[PDB]
Amino acid sequence: FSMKIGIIGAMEEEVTLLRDKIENRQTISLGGCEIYTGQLNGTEVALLKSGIGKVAAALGATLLLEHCKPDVIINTGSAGGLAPTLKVGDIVVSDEARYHDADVTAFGYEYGQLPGCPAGFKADDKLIAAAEACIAELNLNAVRGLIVSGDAFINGSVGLAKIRHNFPQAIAVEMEATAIAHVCHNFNVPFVVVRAISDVADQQSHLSFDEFLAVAAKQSSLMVESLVQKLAHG
């Protein structure tokens, strides 16, 4: 009864469903961000709306950790699906996060690695196990594996090809997860990403996202709600 779960979503649509469900809700406004505090089905939560891309996610995550000191972080939201069995609405769970757009290979760092960081950030094993238990209980289709982040909306063409080449094992792509993982790494806070597929990052991904962002928000929010309850009680 003394756990506080931090949850981070980038777009307002990505946090609005959870935000609705928060009891005794209060809003903290700082640094261009909002954090909603209160309880989700009894469990104390702090839900950050970060805004879009790596710096917004990093600024937001840093305020959430400093102001709220959550025990763990769960990153919720939509994603572009890369793994072949994924369909719109399916869940993706991070094993690990990597930047697809960092390149200091001129000095022999690994592609995707920034100097001062590990080449990728591992998500927490217990959080991952708890997410997989929720996926089973909810009877959802999910893939676990590497999620890659960058400051680009992937829409086929080179951008997609470059990711498939550099990270053939990446299951999904998005724009905040890695930055949240990098902040959590620096503060020793366990994280997991539990997103849902809104598009498959190909030349029609903008139209698929226009159509399916809400479905992905709903599916990822349902998972996060289940996860929070499982973590809190088992």
Ligand X SMILES: Nc1ncnc2c(CN3C[C@H](CSc4ccc(Cl)cc4)[C@@H](O)C3)c[nH]c12
Tell me which residues touch ligand X (CB under 6 A).
Answer: 10-11, 52, 77-80, 104, 107, 115, 153-154, 173-175, 198-199, 201, 205, 209
Residue 129 main-chain phi, psi, to 5 deg: -65, -40
Min separation Cβ 13 and a copy of itself, Å:
12
Which of a copy of itself, ligand X, none has residue 13 at its interface (CB below 5 to 8 Å by kind)?
none
198 binds, among a copy of itself, ligand X, none (CB under 5 to 8 A by kind): ligand X
Degrees to nearest 5, angle at CA 63 with 62 and 67:
125
Q: Looking at 12, 14, 71, 103, which residue is catalytic?
A: 14
CA–CA dist 166, 218 (Å, integer): 31
- Write down the least CB distance from residue 159 to a copy of itself, Å: 7
Q: Which of 95, 96, 174, 199 is catalytic?
A: 199
132 counts as catalytic: no
79 binds, among ligand X, a copy of itself, none (CB under 5 to 8 A by kind): ligand X
Please indicate whether residue 176 is annotated as part of the active site.
no
Q: Are 57 and 193 in contact (CB under 8 A)?
A: no
Q: Which is nearer to a copy of itself, 43 or 167 (CB)?
A: 167
Minimum CB–partner distance for residue 233 and ligand X (Å): 29
d(CA 96, CA 109): 18
User: Which residues touch 188 (CB under 8 Å, ≥6 apart)?
Assistant: none
Give the other-Cβ count within 10 Å of 66's Cβ.
10
Q: How far is the CB of 153 from a copy of itself (least distance, A)?
A: 5
Supply φ then ψ for residue 12, to 5 degrees: -60, -40
